[PDB]
């Protein structure tokens, strides 16, 4: 699983890419970058 930054995803399952520091947000429901 590896979604690009700012991609619609599920925060419960979390399908964002870990290599690009992406996490599924709950309010935005997408891949966000922690800065």
C-alpha positions as a LaTeX table, in Angstrom:
\begin{tabular}{lrrr}
\hline
Residue & $x$ (\AA) & $y$ (\AA) & $z$ (\AA) \\
\hline
Unk1 & 0.00 & 0.00 & 0.00 \\
Unk2 & 1.42 & 3.44 & $-0.94$ \\
Unk3 & $-0.82$ & 6.49 & $-1.61$ \\
Unk4 & 0.73 & 9.79 & $-2.80$ \\
Unk5 & 0.64 & 12.93 & $-0.59$ \\
Unk6 & $-2.90$ & 14.41 & $-0.48$ \\
Unk7 & $-4.66$ & 11.22 & $-1.67$ \\
Unk8 & $-8.12$ & 10.15 & $-0.39$ \\
Unk9 & $-7.45$ & 7.25 & 2.04 \\
Unk10 & $-8.89$ & 5.62 & 5.19 \\
Unk11 & $-7.41$ & 6.67 & 8.56 \\
Unk12 & $-8.56$ & 3.38 & 10.18 \\
Unk13 & $-6.66$ & 1.14 & 7.70 \\
Unk14 & $-4.02$ & 3.76 & 6.70 \\
Unk15 & $-2.82$ & 3.12 & 3.11 \\
Unk16 & $-0.39$ & 6.10 & 2.75 \\
Unk17 & 3.28 & 5.48 & 1.81 \\
Unk18 & 5.57 & 5.26 & 4.88 \\
Unk19 & 8.70 & 6.04 & 2.78 \\
Unk20 & 7.29 & 9.54 & 2.02 \\
Unk21 & 6.20 & 10.11 & 5.68 \\
Unk22 & 2.48 & 10.06 & 4.76 \\
Unk23 & $-0.30$ & 9.30 & 7.29 \\
Unk24 & $-4.09$ & 9.06 & 6.72 \\
Unk25 & $-5.77$ & 12.03 & 8.47 \\
Unk26 & $-9.20$ & 11.74 & 10.14 \\
Unk27 & $-10.49$ & 15.28 & 9.43 \\
Unk28 & $-9.02$ & 15.38 & 5.89 \\
Unk29 & $-9.29$ & 11.57 & 5.32 \\
Unk30 & $-6.16$ & 11.68 & 3.09 \\
Unk31 & $-2.36$ & 11.22 & 3.16 \\
Unk32 & $-0.76$ & 14.09 & 5.13 \\
Unk33 & 2.94 & 14.88 & 5.73 \\
Unk34 & 4.01 & 15.47 & 9.36 \\
Unk35 & 6.29 & 18.55 & 9.49 \\
\hline
\end{tabular}
